[model samples]
Target: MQITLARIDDRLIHGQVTTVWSKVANAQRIIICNDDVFNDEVRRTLLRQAAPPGMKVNVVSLEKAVAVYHNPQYQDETVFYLFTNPHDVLTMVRQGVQIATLNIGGMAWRPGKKQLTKAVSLDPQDIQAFRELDKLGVKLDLRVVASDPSVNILDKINETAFC
Candidate 1:
């Protein structure tokens, strides 16, 4: 009774996500749950077009996603949840989404962030949210792609001092 994979990939619905991760997850539907992306018509459209062949894509606000997933009608549908940040992912889990592990795919190097790996970077708030998620017992799997082995995201977080 859980979504197939709940992933944090800043470049949501890109080539790597459509090809590699999608195959790994093997979900019938892919949902991009972010308020900003859903509100931006241009950004939303591009995401829809990026869906792999025969896979259904749903671009919806985080709140709407929480609502729909609770409905039993959708539970039968295997889902791939794509999120941009830990905050949104935390919200979903808090609101009764049964996600055991969160895959931190690629959070690009931003100005205020400390690099965790080649693909994963974290700002102070990002780190904090990840900490809270860990407290909630969500396994943070740090891997840029399916090819790599999952590293301990919590250990990585503790190792890096926010500057």
Candidate 2:
């Protein structure tokens, strides 16, 4: 599979994904790689409908997602991979999926999580996983839409240390 984009967005398969990122990545298929969503039929159904016309959307467990990426039958398909958190992405990377850059799209605010950006908020676990991804040579880009200026995630993490 040709993974055009690997994104972290808590609200997966939303407007920005269908309108901007899909076009930006020239993605033909969108894979929502989250075990919870995969197991929930209601969420899976909703995400399928949220996808833009003519684009295929697959909500699959992280393990299945990894297998799909390695499957030769999908080698020519341009895929946009979406996950809710950094841990899932890190797991995929550990399982041998090659992702050079990770886009931090939107992780909604949660109680006790510090706001990193308008679209991103992180708790300690999120920060730790992101740090590990950085250590593994993955470039984390903080951006909401395709038009916005992307910031290196390390910069934000470092800035947080002083706050």
Candidate 3:
């Protein structure tokens, strides 16, 4: 499959995706990789309905998404894979998903999360998760929004935030 963008947008399948990124990427399909959202019919339907008409939205668990990614059936379509968390990305990577880059769009701050930037707050676990992703050559980024270029997660910790 041709993935035009592999974005980590917390609010998946929103107006910006429907109107802006889809146009820019020429994405005909959106694949959301989150088991929770896929299982929750209400939220899944809402995400599906948010997509502009003519664009297909597929809410899939990470495993199923990986399967589809490898299948030849999808190779002809242009797709955008949106993920809610780093764990899903990790899983997909381990499952052989060919992710060229990852965008950090909106991870909410939580208790014990050390501030990584004005936009990002990460506890030790978050830092470790990011470090692992970095080690895997995933090109980890710390973009609070889509406009920012990928700020390297490993560099940010030692130079700016997590250290």
Candidate 4:
């Protein structure tokens, strides 16, 4: 599949994604790669329903996603890949997904998670995974919407001693 956008957003297929990013990417399909979502029937059903009319949506486990991504049948589809966290992104990267850039749209602030951007928050593990992704040459862009200017998280991460 031709991946037009590879993003990490904890909220998955929400308003911002259905309206902005999907159009920005001109995606024919949205493939959500998350083990939890894959197994959660309610979430998967809701996410599938969230797509705009005529747009295909699939919530698949990471392993299934890797296999489907490499299949010839899906090669022509314009895909917008979404992940819930950095670790999943890193896993797919290591598994040979040819992604050059990772957009951080939303990683919601929660207890024990430090705010990275107004729309994004990260725990220590998230920071480490991000660091690893950076080390592996993945460009990280932090932005809440497609129109907003991206924040260079690499510089921000480097500047933070604890990260």
The TM-score values for the models, in the order shown, are 0.93, 0.94, 0.86, 0.93
Poorest 10 consecutive residues by lDDT, candidate 1: 154-163
- Identify the leading candidate in terms of TM-score: 2
Error of 1 at 120 (Å): 1.3
Give the C-alpha lDDT of model 3: 0.77
- Which of the two, 1 or 2, has more lDDT? 2
- Put down candidate 4 lDDT per residue, 25-108, tens digits, no spaces: 888999999988888889899998898776888999999999998999988989999998999999999999988899998888
Tens digits of per-residue lDDT for model 2, 54-158: 788999999899998889999899988999999999999999988999999888998999988798888888998988999999999888887789998878879
- Among the numbered candidates, top lDDT falls to 2
Q: Which has the better lDDT: candidate 2, or candidate 3? A: 2
Clashing pairs in 1: none
Give the lowest summed-lDDT range of ten residues in model 2: 13-22
- Residue range 1-163, candidate 3, lDDT tens digits: 8888777767776665346766655788988999888899899889888877688888998889988989998888888888876777888888888887777766667787677677567777767777778889888766755566768767878895544
- Candidate RMSDs in Å, in order, are 1.8, 1.6, 2.2, 1.4
Task: Please report, as a residue range, the 10-residue window in candidate 4 with the lowest summed lDDT.
Answer: 154-163
Note the Cα lDDT for every prediction shown.
Answer: 0.86, 0.88, 0.77, 0.87
Question: What TM-score would you give candidate 2 relative to the actual structure?
Answer: 0.94
lDDT tens digits, residue span 105-148, model 1: 88888788888778888877898898889899999998888888
